[PDB]
Amino acid sequence: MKRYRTLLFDVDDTILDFQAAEALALRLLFEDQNIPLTNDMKAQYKTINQGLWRAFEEGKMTRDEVVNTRFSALLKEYGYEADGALLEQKYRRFLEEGHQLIDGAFDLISNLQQQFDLYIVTNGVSHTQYKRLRDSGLFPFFKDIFVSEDTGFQKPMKEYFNYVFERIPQFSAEHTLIIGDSLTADIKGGQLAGLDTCWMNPDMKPNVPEIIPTYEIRKLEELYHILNIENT
């Protein structure tokens, strides 16, 4: 039977609770600006932010443009003249203080480190991901951290994965699994790159693009059975 050797983990909403970090950072940003954060505004922020990150994944926008325009795009249509780069800098500081964990992530990663080689694969801002991984105690369990900004490309692009593969000693695709919550960055990314994929989908979101993962789970602890190792 197949035994994976190398696990590539996405960060946000895979092992760290990015939703929680985002929720806190948005609240604090809007309090900082003394602007009421209505349900309608929060919903539009999420749609705008999602569309801009997708444009970046697709190669249609730089990440800097994504993060430096999302808050000006939102506030401008609600009638506020806003400096998108300044708002992002404030948001960024608050986001970098949120290192909430996904349920079971610490115990899972600690257990897997004993039997597999673990790596991080992320499109997130390098400083932000390093800091949140350090603060949550996850950082030392990973052999390396591969950030899109070093590569010239981003998940799901095949060239991002080429960069990662060249930097894993004795890399074998057949013995590698990528685990992440994004159909578009992680699952499409891994599939393109010749990897088995594991979709973290706790909320049983639909698969609108029909990007089919090798596995789909709701909780990280379901990995023990997929990886065929005993939980401890």
Side-chain angles (χ1 to χ4, degrees), residues 200-223:
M200 175 62 174
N201 189 22
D203 295 328
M204 303 176 60
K205 292 177 188 297
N207 196 332
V208 193
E210 301 181 26
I211 296 169
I212 311 304
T214 314
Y215 315 97
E216 179 182 353
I217 62 184
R218 294 175 73 189
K219 296 190 297 199
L220 290 173
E221 62 181 26
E222 296 174 49
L223 280 169

Side-chain angles (χ1 to χ4, degrees), residues 2-60:
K2 155 107 87 152
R3 266 273 186 294
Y4 296 99
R5 290 197 291 271
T6 305
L7 311 176
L8 313 181
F9 277 92
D10 174 68
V11 178
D12 292 326
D13 295 321
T14 299
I15 56 183
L16 289 184
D17 182 353
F18 182 82
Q19 299 304 112
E22 173 182 73
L24 175 57
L26 288 175
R27 187 180 49 92
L28 296 179
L29 174 72
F30 278 71
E31 291 185 1
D32 181 80
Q33 296 297 291
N34 304 307
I35 296 178
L37 179 54
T38 70
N39 287 341
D40 290 351
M41 287 166 83
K42 200 148 49 134
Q44 291 306 302
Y45 171 73
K46 293 194 178 97
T47 304
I48 286 162
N49 185 53
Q50 169 69 16
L52 298 171
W53 283 84
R54 285 290 296 123
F56 157 70
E57 289 171 8
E58 291 156 17
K60 292 177 174 200

Side-chain angles (χ1 to χ4, degrees), residues 159-173:
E159 303 88 343
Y160 168 86
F161 290 98
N162 291 344
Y163 179 103
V164 173
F165 301 166
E166 288 301 306
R167 286 157 182 82
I168 296 172
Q170 299 280 84
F171 173 73
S172 163

Side-chain angles (χ1 to χ4, degrees), residues 101-113 138 141 224 231-232:
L101 288 160
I102 296 288
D103 285 344
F106 187 94
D107 292 343
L108 173 84
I109 293 302
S110 175
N111 280 336
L112 301 184
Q113 186 278 337
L138 295 177
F141 295 107
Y224 294 119
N231 182 359
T232 189

